[PDB]
């Protein structure tokens, strides 16, 4: 088996609703330097005529930094969504919801560019990305 422990990606049994289209503003939950980002695209997604790309918990998006340190503003980066306001179903049939739309800035491979994550991290995102789960302090 390749990359037994160095793998940066995983799989999840739950698929959260894509409640965040292109143009949504996400709060940065880590200390990489950014504070607010805007979605300008969703990777690994094919749309259709006049359809905006949408992402949910555990999805990777391409975003432009709006607020943060001077060396981070106006920069195109990759982020992984860890919390969303739109409730989504889990295996037991129960719906889970969060308080805000929050994401963590990571490299395209999936290695976070920060060292601390604020607030809970969705179990789906933690399973999808091992590094995010490893660095997360609260997972629910």
């Amino acid at each position: 088996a390749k990359k037994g422990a160095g793998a940066t990606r995983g799989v999840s049994a739950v698929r959260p609703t894509r409640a965040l289209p292109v143009g949504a503003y996400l709060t940065v939950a880590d200390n990489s330097g950014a504070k607010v980002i805007q979605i300008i695209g969703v990777v690994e997604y094919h749309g259709t005529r006049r359809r905006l790309a949408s992402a949910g918990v555990g999805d990777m998006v391409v975003a432009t930094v709006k607020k943060g340190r001077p060396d981070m503003r106006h920069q195109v980066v990759r982020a992984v969504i860890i919390r969303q306001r739109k409730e989504y179903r889990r295996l037991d049939g129960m719906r889970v919801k969060f308080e805000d739309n929050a994401a963590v800035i990571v490299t395209p491979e999936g290695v976070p560019r920060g060292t601390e994550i604020r607030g809970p991290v969705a179990r789906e995102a933690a399973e999808r990305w091992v590094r995010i789960g490893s660095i997360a302090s609260i997972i629910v």
Partner: protein, 63 residues
């Protein structure tokens, strides 16, 4: 196969229904319906509603 207990009316609801709300500070609440969720978030007092389990505690509180 566990009956979650609503955080507003203090009653159990069947598996496959309801929802869980996660707060930023890390705590979790369970809501059996949109009615209970909306009342909790608006701030309606559950100790004054006879159909909630908190009313029994309030009755013991007063006497």
């Amino acid at each position: 196969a566990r009956w979650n207990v609503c955080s507003y009316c203090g009653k159990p609801f069947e598996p496959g229904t309801g929802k869980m709300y996660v707060r930023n500070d890390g705590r979790v609440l369970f809501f059996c319906s949109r009615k209970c969720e909306r009342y909790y978030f608006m701030g309606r007092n559950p100790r004054k509603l006879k159909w909630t389990k908190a009313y029994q505690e309030a009755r013991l509180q007063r006497g």
